[PDB]
Amino acid sequence: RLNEQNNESYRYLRSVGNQWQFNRLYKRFDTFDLDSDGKMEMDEVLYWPDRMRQLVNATDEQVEKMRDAVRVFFLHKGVEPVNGLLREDWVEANRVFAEAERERERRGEPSLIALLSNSYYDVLDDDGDGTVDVDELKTMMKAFDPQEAAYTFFEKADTDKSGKLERTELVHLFRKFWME
Ligand SMILES: [Mg+2]
Ligand SMILES: [Mg+2]
Ligand SMILES: [Mg+2]
């Protein structure tokens, strides 16, 4: 069972008075239980920024900003600080987070997906031109475990055909991906 006591998204919804109730997906979980112990843990998810950090390019501040966004993001996705997130609570945790994000949009509050995206944006672009290119996106894939395949994400996200992903466009990429 998931509720305001063991899940941050229910904590968020009830803090603002939203009474929402929960009544492929698992493959994503299995990609994220690195040790396959069927629990996702904060040390485990915090591995992903550690990999990204080794592949670039980036300042301590930029890396820490990303580390923090990843931590906030997975916490709200249900990964509790010490207790983690069991495979059996994964599906719910996902849907409650989707509601929390819709509620944040309704209240004009910052998307946690957007926070995560913007944090990665500053780490993915570190020739410091100030935009992300398709080679830079390749690095993102390799960090989240396949480089060619970023050509697919990329074409979908550069709706101006500029040849570079700009902040807005990356937010759209991450955003669409969790929900569709
Ligand atoms: Mg695990
Ligand atoms: Mg760049
Ligand atoms: Mg563009």
Side-chain angles (χ1 to χ4, degrees), residues 11 14 24 28 32 42 49 53-54 67 74 78 109 113 119 121 123 149 160 163 173 180:
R11 298 192 169 111
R14 304 303 188 255
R24 181 178 58 257
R28 285 203 192 172
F32 278 89
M42 191 62 82
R53 156 182 206 164
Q54 299 280 16
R67 163 168 294 259
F74 284 99
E109 298 174 350
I113 295 174
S119 76
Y121 193 91
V123 170
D160 76 7
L173 190 152
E180 179 127 347

PDB file of all heavy atoms in Angstrom, residues 11 14 24 28 32 42 49 53-54 67 74 78 109 113 119 121 123 149 160 163 173 180:
ATOM      1  N   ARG A  11       2.090  12.584  -0.170  1.00  0.00           N
ATOM      2  CA  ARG A  11       2.377  13.660   0.786  1.00  0.00           C
ATOM      3  C   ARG A  11       2.086  15.001   0.138  1.00  0.00           C
ATOM      4  O   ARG A  11       1.439  15.849   0.737  1.00  0.00           O
ATOM      5  CB  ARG A  11       3.849  13.672   1.230  1.00  0.00           C
ATOM      6  CG  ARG A  11       4.349  12.424   1.955  1.00  0.00           C
ATOM      7  CD  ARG A  11       5.716  12.652   2.595  1.00  0.00           C
ATOM      8  NE  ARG A  11       6.114  11.583   3.517  1.00  0.00           N
ATOM      9  CZ  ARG A  11       7.099  10.717   3.295  1.00  0.00           C
ATOM     10  NH1 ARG A  11       7.809  10.771   2.174  1.00  0.00           N
ATOM     11  NH2 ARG A  11       7.377   9.792   4.200  1.00  0.00           N
ATOM     12  N   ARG A  14      -1.869  15.423  -0.723  1.00  0.00           N
ATOM     13  CA  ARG A  14      -2.660  15.704   0.472  1.00  0.00           C
ATOM     14  C   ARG A  14      -2.272  17.014   1.140  1.00  0.00           C
ATOM     15  O   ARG A  14      -3.123  17.654   1.745  1.00  0.00           O
ATOM     16  CB  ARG A  14      -2.593  14.567   1.490  1.00  0.00           C
ATOM     17  CG  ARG A  14      -3.021  13.222   0.938  1.00  0.00           C
ATOM     18  CD  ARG A  14      -4.414  13.182   0.359  1.00  0.00           C
ATOM     19  NE  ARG A  14      -4.751  11.792   0.041  1.00  0.00           N
ATOM     20  CZ  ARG A  14      -4.785  11.281  -1.188  1.00  0.00           C
ATOM     21  NH1 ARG A  14      -4.535  12.043  -2.237  1.00  0.00           N
ATOM     22  NH2 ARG A  14      -5.094  10.003  -1.363  1.00  0.00           N
ATOM     23  N   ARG A  24       7.152  -3.367 -19.418  1.00  0.00           N
ATOM     24  CA  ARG A  24       7.090  -1.987 -19.889  1.00  0.00           C
ATOM     25  C   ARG A  24       7.298  -1.028 -18.733  1.00  0.00           C
ATOM     26  O   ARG A  24       8.361  -0.416 -18.599  1.00  0.00           O
ATOM     27  CB  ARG A  24       5.741  -1.705 -20.546  1.00  0.00           C
ATOM     28  CG  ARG A  24       5.608  -0.294 -21.098  1.00  0.00           C
ATOM     29  CD  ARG A  24       4.262  -0.096 -21.769  1.00  0.00           C
ATOM     30  NE  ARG A  24       3.154  -0.353 -20.852  1.00  0.00           N
ATOM     31  CZ  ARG A  24       2.424  -1.466 -20.856  1.00  0.00           C
ATOM     32  NH1 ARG A  24       2.686  -2.429 -21.734  1.00  0.00           N
ATOM     33  NH2 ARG A  24       1.438  -1.616 -19.982  1.00  0.00           N
ATOM     34  N   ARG A  28      11.017  -0.752 -16.840  1.00  0.00           N
ATOM     35  CA  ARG A  28      11.712   0.447 -16.382  1.00  0.00           C
ATOM     36  C   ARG A  28      12.201   0.229 -14.961  1.00  0.00           C
ATOM     37  O   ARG A  28      13.315   0.623 -14.617  1.00  0.00           O
ATOM     38  CB  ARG A  28      10.801   1.687 -16.426  1.00  0.00           C
ATOM     39  CG  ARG A  28      10.538   2.283 -17.817  1.00  0.00           C
ATOM     40  CD  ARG A  28      10.133   3.753 -17.710  1.00  0.00           C
ATOM     41  NE  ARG A  28       9.594   4.316 -18.953  1.00  0.00           N
ATOM     42  CZ  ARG A  28       9.043   5.527 -19.043  1.00  0.00           C
ATOM     43  NH1 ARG A  28       8.965   6.296 -17.970  1.00  0.00           N
ATOM     44  NH2 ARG A  28       8.574   5.980 -20.199  1.00  0.00           N
ATOM     45  N   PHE A  32      16.207  -0.016 -13.437  1.00  0.00           N
ATOM     46  CA  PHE A  32      16.599   0.792 -12.327  1.00  0.00           C
ATOM     47  C   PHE A  32      16.985   0.065 -11.028  1.00  0.00           C
ATOM     48  O   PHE A  32      17.602   0.664 -10.209  1.00  0.00           O
ATOM     49  CB  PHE A  32      15.482   1.857 -12.041  1.00  0.00           C
ATOM     50  CG  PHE A  32      15.548   3.069 -12.917  1.00  0.00           C
ATOM     51  CD1 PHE A  32      14.904   3.099 -14.089  1.00  0.00           C
ATOM     52  CD2 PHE A  32      16.287   4.147 -12.553  1.00  0.00           C
ATOM     53  CE1 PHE A  32      14.974   4.189 -14.898  1.00  0.00           C
ATOM     54  CE2 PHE A  32      16.376   5.233 -13.357  1.00  0.00           C
ATOM     55  CZ  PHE A  32      15.709   5.253 -14.535  1.00  0.00           C
ATOM     56  N   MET A  42      17.837   4.774  -3.002  1.00  0.00           N
ATOM     57  CA  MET A  42      18.355   6.098  -3.286  1.00  0.00           C
ATOM     58  C   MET A  42      19.833   6.077  -3.699  1.00  0.00           C
ATOM     59  O   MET A  42      20.242   6.855  -4.554  1.00  0.00           O
ATOM     60  CB  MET A  42      18.109   7.034  -2.094  1.00  0.00           C
ATOM     61  CG  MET A  42      18.363   8.511  -2.384  1.00  0.00           C
ATOM     62  SD  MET A  42      17.298   9.196  -3.659  1.00  0.00           S
ATOM     63  CE  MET A  42      15.797   9.574  -2.744  1.00  0.00           C
ATOM     64  N   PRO A  49      23.533   9.947 -11.923  1.00  0.00           N
ATOM     65  CA  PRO A  49      24.388  11.140 -11.997  1.00  0.00           C
ATOM     66  C   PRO A  49      25.885  10.867 -11.870  1.00  0.00           C
ATOM     67  O   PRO A  49      26.684  11.569 -12.504  1.00  0.00           O
ATOM     68  CB  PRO A  49      23.897  12.016 -10.825  1.00  0.00           C
ATOM     69  CG  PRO A  49      23.073  11.118  -9.974  1.00  0.00           C
ATOM     70  CD  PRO A  49      22.447  10.154 -10.946  1.00  0.00           C
ATOM     71  N   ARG A  53      28.554  12.177 -14.577  1.00  0.00           N
ATOM     72  CA  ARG A  53      29.612  13.055 -14.115  1.00  0.00           C
ATOM     73  C   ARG A  53      30.969  12.613 -14.654  1.00  0.00           C
ATOM     74  O   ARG A  53      31.829  13.439 -14.938  1.00  0.00           O
ATOM     75  CB  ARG A  53      29.621  13.060 -12.588  1.00  0.00           C
ATOM     76  CG  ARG A  53      30.938  13.429 -11.955  1.00  0.00           C
ATOM     77  CD  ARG A  53      30.806  13.334 -10.453  1.00  0.00           C
ATOM     78  NE  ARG A  53      31.750  14.198  -9.756  1.00  0.00           N
ATOM     79  CZ  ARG A  53      31.643  14.535  -8.476  1.00  0.00           C
ATOM     80  NH1 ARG A  53      30.642  14.073  -7.747  1.00  0.00           N
ATOM     81  NH2 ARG A  53      32.546  15.331  -7.924  1.00  0.00           N
ATOM     82  N   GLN A  54      31.143  11.307 -14.816  1.00  0.00           N
ATOM     83  CA  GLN A  54      32.414  10.763 -15.308  1.00  0.00           C
ATOM     84  C   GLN A  54      32.595  10.961 -16.813  1.00  0.00           C
ATOM     85  O   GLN A  54      33.702  10.907 -17.317  1.00  0.00           O
ATOM     86  CB  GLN A  54      32.483   9.277 -14.976  1.00  0.00           C
ATOM     87  CG  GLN A  54      32.434   9.014 -13.493  1.00  0.00           C
ATOM     88  CD  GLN A  54      33.796   9.242 -12.846  1.00  0.00           C
ATOM     89  OE1 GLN A  54      34.676   9.857 -13.441  1.00  0.00           O
ATOM     90  NE2 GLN A  54      33.974   8.738 -11.632  1.00  0.00           N
ATOM     91  N   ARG A  67      22.766  16.143  -9.252  1.00  0.00           N
ATOM     92  CA  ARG A  67      22.653  15.124  -8.206  1.00  0.00           C
ATOM     93  C   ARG A  67      21.399  15.372  -7.360  1.00  0.00           C
ATOM     94  O   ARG A  67      20.651  14.453  -7.041  1.00  0.00           O
ATOM     95  CB  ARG A  67      23.897  15.124  -7.322  1.00  0.00           C
ATOM     96  CG  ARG A  67      23.712  14.425  -6.003  1.00  0.00           C
ATOM     97  CD  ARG A  67      25.050  14.210  -5.324  1.00  0.00           C
ATOM     98  NE  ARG A  67      25.882  13.283  -6.076  1.00  0.00           N
ATOM     99  CZ  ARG A  67      26.047  12.005  -5.749  1.00  0.00           C
ATOM    100  NH1 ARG A  67      25.433  11.515  -4.676  1.00  0.00           N
ATOM    101  NH2 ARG A  67      26.822  11.221  -6.489  1.00  0.00           N
ATOM    102  N   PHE A  74      13.432  11.162  -7.894  1.00  0.00           N
ATOM    103  CA  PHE A  74      13.150   9.786  -7.484  1.00  0.00           C
ATOM    104  C   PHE A  74      12.448   9.633  -6.137  1.00  0.00           C
ATOM    105  O   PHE A  74      11.675   8.701  -5.945  1.00  0.00           O
ATOM    106  CB  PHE A  74      14.421   8.923  -7.537  1.00  0.00           C
ATOM    107  CG  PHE A  74      14.783   8.553  -8.915  1.00  0.00           C
ATOM    108  CD1 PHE A  74      15.763   9.263  -9.611  1.00  0.00           C
ATOM    109  CD2 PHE A  74      14.102   7.529  -9.558  1.00  0.00           C
ATOM    110  CE1 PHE A  74      16.061   8.944 -10.908  1.00  0.00           C
ATOM    111  CE2 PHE A  74      14.426   7.188 -10.863  1.00  0.00           C
ATOM    112  CZ  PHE A  74      15.402   7.906 -11.539  1.00  0.00           C
ATOM    113  N   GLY A  78       8.756   7.994  -5.587  1.00  0.00           N
ATOM    114  CA  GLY A  78       8.411   6.960  -4.616  1.00  0.00           C
ATOM    115  C   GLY A  78       9.573   6.308  -3.875  1.00  0.00           C
ATOM    116  O   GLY A  78       9.397   5.612  -2.883  1.00  0.00           O
ATOM    117  N   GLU A 109       3.232  25.537 -10.279  1.00  0.00           N
ATOM    118  CA  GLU A 109       4.457  25.190  -9.554  1.00  0.00           C
ATOM    119  C   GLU A 109       5.434  24.449 -10.456  1.00  0.00           C
ATOM    120  O   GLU A 109       5.021  23.801 -11.434  1.00  0.00           O
ATOM    121  CB  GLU A 109       4.131  24.376  -8.294  1.00  0.00           C
ATOM    122  CG  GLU A 109       3.261  25.154  -7.285  1.00  0.00           C
ATOM    123  CD  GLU A 109       2.800  24.313  -6.108  1.00  0.00           C
ATOM    124  OE1 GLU A 109       2.983  23.077  -6.136  1.00  0.00           O
ATOM    125  OE2 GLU A 109       2.241  24.893  -5.150  1.00  0.00           O
ATOM    126  N   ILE A 113       9.935  16.995 -13.275  1.00  0.00           N
ATOM    127  CA  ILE A 113      10.535  16.584 -14.540  1.00  0.00           C
ATOM    128  C   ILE A 113      11.360  17.722 -15.176  1.00  0.00           C
ATOM    129  O   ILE A 113      12.496  17.507 -15.662  1.00  0.00           O
ATOM    130  CB  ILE A 113       9.462  16.048 -15.505  1.00  0.00           C
ATOM    131  CG1 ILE A 113       8.854  14.763 -14.938  1.00  0.00           C
ATOM    132  CG2 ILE A 113      10.039  15.771 -16.875  1.00  0.00           C
ATOM    133  CD1 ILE A 113       7.697  14.227 -15.747  1.00  0.00           C
ATOM    134  N   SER A 119      18.534  20.403 -14.893  1.00  0.00           N
ATOM    135  CA  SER A 119      19.773  20.027 -14.213  1.00  0.00           C
ATOM    136  C   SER A 119      20.696  19.237 -15.140  1.00  0.00           C
ATOM    137  O   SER A 119      21.907  19.481 -15.169  1.00  0.00           O
ATOM    138  CB  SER A 119      19.498  19.255 -12.919  1.00  0.00           C
ATOM    139  OG  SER A 119      19.105  17.912 -13.177  1.00  0.00           O
ATOM    140  N   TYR A 121      20.569  19.372 -18.486  1.00  0.00           N
ATOM    141  CA  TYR A 121      20.911  20.301 -19.571  1.00  0.00           C
ATOM    142  C   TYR A 121      22.262  20.988 -19.343  1.00  0.00           C
ATOM    143  O   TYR A 121      23.118  21.010 -20.227  1.00  0.00           O
ATOM    144  CB  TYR A 121      19.786  21.340 -19.748  1.00  0.00           C
ATOM    145  CG  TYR A 121      19.865  22.151 -21.026  1.00  0.00           C
ATOM    146  CD1 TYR A 121      19.229  21.730 -22.184  1.00  0.00           C
ATOM    147  CD2 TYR A 121      20.590  23.334 -21.073  1.00  0.00           C
ATOM    148  CE1 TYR A 121      19.300  22.482 -23.358  1.00  0.00           C
ATOM    149  CE2 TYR A 121      20.674  24.086 -22.242  1.00  0.00           C
ATOM    150  CZ  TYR A 121      20.023  23.657 -23.371  1.00  0.00           C
ATOM    151  OH  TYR A 121      20.113  24.413 -24.513  1.00  0.00           O
ATOM    152  N   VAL A 123      24.681  19.937 -17.499  1.00  0.00           N
ATOM    153  CA  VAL A 123      25.752  18.937 -17.458  1.00  0.00           C
ATOM    154  C   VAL A 123      26.008  18.326 -18.841  1.00  0.00           C
ATOM    155  O   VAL A 123      27.139  17.961 -19.178  1.00  0.00           O
ATOM    156  CB  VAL A 123      25.438  17.818 -16.425  1.00  0.00           C
ATOM    157  CG1 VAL A 123      26.421  16.665 -16.552  1.00  0.00           C
ATOM    158  CG2 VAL A 123      25.436  18.369 -15.002  1.00  0.00           C
ATOM    159  N   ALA A 149      20.463   5.955 -31.099  1.00  0.00           N
ATOM    160  CA  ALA A 149      19.183   5.901 -30.442  1.00  0.00           C
ATOM    161  C   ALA A 149      18.877   7.273 -29.891  1.00  0.00           C
ATOM    162  O   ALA A 149      17.772   7.561 -29.560  1.00  0.00           O
ATOM    163  CB  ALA A 149      19.158   4.892 -29.327  1.00  0.00           C
ATOM    164  N   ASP A 160      12.163  23.000 -34.104  1.00  0.00           N
ATOM    165  CA  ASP A 160      12.680  24.029 -35.000  1.00  0.00           C
ATOM    166  C   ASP A 160      13.786  23.607 -36.001  1.00  0.00           C
ATOM    167  O   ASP A 160      14.167  24.359 -36.837  1.00  0.00           O
ATOM    168  CB  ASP A 160      13.052  25.266 -34.223  1.00  0.00           C
ATOM    169  CG  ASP A 160      14.309  25.144 -33.475  1.00  0.00           C
ATOM    170  OD1 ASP A 160      14.997  24.165 -33.616  1.00  0.00           O
ATOM    171  OD2 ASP A 160      14.605  26.061 -32.746  1.00  0.00           O
ATOM    172  N   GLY A 163      19.214  21.985 -34.983  1.00  0.00           N
ATOM    173  CA  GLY A 163      20.362  21.096 -34.977  1.00  0.00           C
ATOM    174  C   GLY A 163      20.879  20.956 -33.559  1.00  0.00           C
ATOM    175  O   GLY A 163      21.760  20.141 -33.278  1.00  0.00           O
ATOM    176  N   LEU A 173      11.259  16.585 -24.066  1.00  0.00           N
ATOM    177  CA  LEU A 173      11.762  15.215 -24.207  1.00  0.00           C
ATOM    178  C   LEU A 173      11.517  14.380 -22.953  1.00  0.00           C
ATOM    179  O   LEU A 173      10.905  13.310 -23.019  1.00  0.00           O
ATOM    180  CB  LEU A 173      13.264  15.248 -24.520  1.00  0.00           C
ATOM    181  CG  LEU A 173      14.093  14.025 -24.956  1.00  0.00           C
ATOM    182  CD1 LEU A 173      15.279  14.464 -25.815  1.00  0.00           C
ATOM    183  CD2 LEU A 173      14.610  13.179 -23.784  1.00  0.00           C
ATOM    184  N   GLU A 180       3.799   9.770 -21.429  1.00  0.00           N
ATOM    185  CA  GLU A 180       3.517   9.752 -22.857  1.00  0.00           C
ATOM    186  C   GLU A 180       2.203  10.481 -23.127  1.00  0.00           C
ATOM    187  O   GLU A 180       2.179  11.693 -23.107  1.00  0.00           O
ATOM    188  CB  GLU A 180       3.659   8.379 -23.547  1.00  0.00           C
ATOM    189  CG  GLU A 180       3.333   8.386 -25.039  1.00  0.00           C
ATOM    190  CD  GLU A 180       4.420   7.785 -25.931  1.00  0.00           C
ATOM    191  OE1 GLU A 180       5.530   7.586 -25.434  1.00  0.00           O
ATOM    192  OE2 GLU A 180       4.185   7.489 -27.122  1.00  0.00           O
TER     193      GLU A 180
END
